[PDB]
């Protein structure tokens, strides 16, 4: 539908190459303020804070990075920065008051994606890693500290995104994307893979998936139930889990090469919106009612991200992050919208009943559109 043009942005310098999953935003220094973490192939991870054009600080690993994350993996209640290299290493950093890691451990190599969440429901956070050859492995941190393995699943179609979604009955569920606009459910038994199919043209399209999309205010840890999938041939689908079968809320067909999927609350009313980005920089924002908002960045995109960031005045605000080919990262931090649809003023005043009563008292019938137009003009531009 309507297109917009965001203006305010901050450009950050970045010299290196990266995978589309080596970028994240979150609180690494534990100050209730978000910071930006980017992992370069070279073996260095840059953390940006506030709006400096230079990295706030750099931490050097060994090997080439493939996944980065911020989370309370150690279950100590303090967020840590965790990096997974390509050759199977696992580095940890604590940055709450260079930067050699505080803990290393070798794990299986060929890592592709990574997630930190409590999947079983035991109140302790587990770590999930998806590998490049359709193999998913779960781990948990155990104090002597050291990671110990858990169930491992094997799949046929390629693995692109991991998610945790509240199931039909108040329980977390581990979901994985499967090519051809399909997905799989992994059972944390401690068949172990329940495939599901969602129409369709190819069977090798790369698919991406996001889950646990909020639906109201103050009901973040209190529930979930919506998830979304996107296919490289330009198809987005938002659907809800429930018990019997997964009800599909809506589907949208665009003509670009979608390669990322995030969630962000831009309207500020509690509900979260689906954010998708193509390779050429076209970005789509859709709410839970198929109301689309487009935004075109006239460049070519290497990597994408969205979330709360602290850029100005020490405040967390919604932000869109793009990585360009010109050694720059653009952070847009003024993306809030008053609404998503377009309405003028008469339809907005018509909802309120006070306006109806207050005009009925005046003796004017509110069904005569020109008369009300004249009255509104007099009230707005000639207040005396």
């Amino acid at each position: 539908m309507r297109s917009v043009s965001y203006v305010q942005r901050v450009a950050l310098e970045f010299s290196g190459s990266l995978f589309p999953h080596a970028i994240c935003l979150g609180d690494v220094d534990n100050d209730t303020l978000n910071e930006l973490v980017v992992g370069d192939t070279s073996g260095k991870v840059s953390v940006y804070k506030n709006d400096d054009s230079r990295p706030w600080l750099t931490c050097s690993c060994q090997g080439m990075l493939t996944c980065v994350g911020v989370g309370d993996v150690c279950n100590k209640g303090k967020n840590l920065l965790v990096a997974v290299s390509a050759e199977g290493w696992f580095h940890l950093f604590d940055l709450t008051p260079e930067q050699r890691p505080v803990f290393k451990q070798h794990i299986p190599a060929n890592t592709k994606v990574m997630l930190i969440s409590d999947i079983d429901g035991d109140g302790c956070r587990e770590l999930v890693v998806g590998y490049t050859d359709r193999v998913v492995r779960a781990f948990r941190w155990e104090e002597l500290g050291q990671l110990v393995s858990l169930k491992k699943w094997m799949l046929e179609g390629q693995v692109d995104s991991l998610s945790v979604t509240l199931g039909p009955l108040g329980l977390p569920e581990l979901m994985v994307s499967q090519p051809g606009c399909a997905y799989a459910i992994l059972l944390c038994t401690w068949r172990d893979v329940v495939l599901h199919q969602t129409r369709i043209h190819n069977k090798n399209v790369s698919t991406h998936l996001i889950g646990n999309i909020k639906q109201g205010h103050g009901t973040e840890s209190s529930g979930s139930g919506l998830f979304a999938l996107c296919t490289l041939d330009g198809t987005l689908k938002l659907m809800e889990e429930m018990e019997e079968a997964d009800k599909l809320l809506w589907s949208v067909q665009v003509d670009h090469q979608l390669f990322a999927l995030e969630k962000l609350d831009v309207t500020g009313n509690g509900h979260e919106e689906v954010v998708a980005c193509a390779w050429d920089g076209q970005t789509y924002i859709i709410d839970h009612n198929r109301t689309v908002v487009r935004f075109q960045v006239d460049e070519n995109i290497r990597a994408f991200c969205a979330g709360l960031y602290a850029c100005k005045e020490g405040r967390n605000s919604p932000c869109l992050v793009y990585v360009t080919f010109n050694q720059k990262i653009y952070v847009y931090w003024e993306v809030q919208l008053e609404r998503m649809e377009s309405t003028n003023l008469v339809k907005l005043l018509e909802t309120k009943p006070e306006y109806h009563s207050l005009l009925q008292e005046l003796g004017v019938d509110p069904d005569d559109l020109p008369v009300t137009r004249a009255l509104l003009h007099q009230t707005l531009y000639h207040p005396d």
Binding site: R2, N344, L358
Partner: protein, 400 residues
Amino acid sequence: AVAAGPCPLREDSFTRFSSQSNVYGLAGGAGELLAATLKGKVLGFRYQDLRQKIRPVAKELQFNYIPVDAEIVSIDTFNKSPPKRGLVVGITFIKDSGDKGSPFLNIYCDYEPGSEYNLDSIAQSCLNLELQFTPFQLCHAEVQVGDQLETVFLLSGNDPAIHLYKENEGLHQFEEQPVENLFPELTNLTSSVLWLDVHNFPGTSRRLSALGCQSGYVRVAHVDQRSREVLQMWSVLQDGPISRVIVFSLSEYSVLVASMLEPAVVYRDLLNRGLEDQLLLPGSDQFDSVLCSLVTDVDLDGRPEVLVATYGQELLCYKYRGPESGLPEAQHGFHLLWQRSFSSPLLAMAHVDLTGDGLQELAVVSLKGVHILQHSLIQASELVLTRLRHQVEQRRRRLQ
């Protein structure tokens, strides 16, 4: 140099342009809007109601006798006088005759009854006139002849002159006529008039004409219409091209002058003080060059404010501290109200009600396309209710 508050404007839509336009690109029409691109493309903007929402519509229009190699320079449109009916469009472009420009002017007006307002039908009814000069700005003015009103076209030329085009009711076509007959104040020019304004006086038969040229020369003339004589005339010479001049009343008349290398200024009380009372708008030159301007009520207070758009992608708004407020220390003058930023240089604007609610939208044509900006509906809704309830309470108190 510091905004006294935030901008109450929220962007609604944004239509992208394949190529750019110029300061004469924007024009009215109708509540529709016409925007012309340098490479012949012409677009029409409007809104379509849909049950409980509205949807922007930006269609393309095709005009008859414009060669595919032609380059459009300026465009204008107006409505016929009340005794007549119809919409008139005019486009001045340049064919590329090998190595030399061949200027041309086309006038579109459909005379078939029942189709004088159909834009599609009007799109092919054009005349074709050669120029012998490179045109600058097409504008229109309303004059009184006999006991009736007429609308005429004014075009500034490469030769320091203004050419008048007037309809002939005989054969139904426009003809060039001498300018000195109706506009004695628009003669004896020595530079290229970049902008020209003609402000009539409602209810009487006088007017003020203002113009600014490339050299910086600015001329204002208080002129009668019944006797076709120049009552008074003032002039001044600033530095840099005069990008804009407007005539408005602060409450007495005053003139806004927007140059390119100097701050915009306002000369107050023309009919009583000429060009001596000069108030400069503070800090209005720190954002590169001012390209456009507009004077209207962007405040909903009943009194006008001043909008200034710069090449540095800025949309400053200035408000006038009335002396009735009584602060002679920081005496009656202009201070920055708010300020907004864009992504491309700003070229034109208009203040017109597109949605159809009685609230006026601001259309801004920049390098990359057309932005539509609306007043914040939350602020505008909570503001109507207070005024209405005050009105009804006052009625109850004063009626009993």
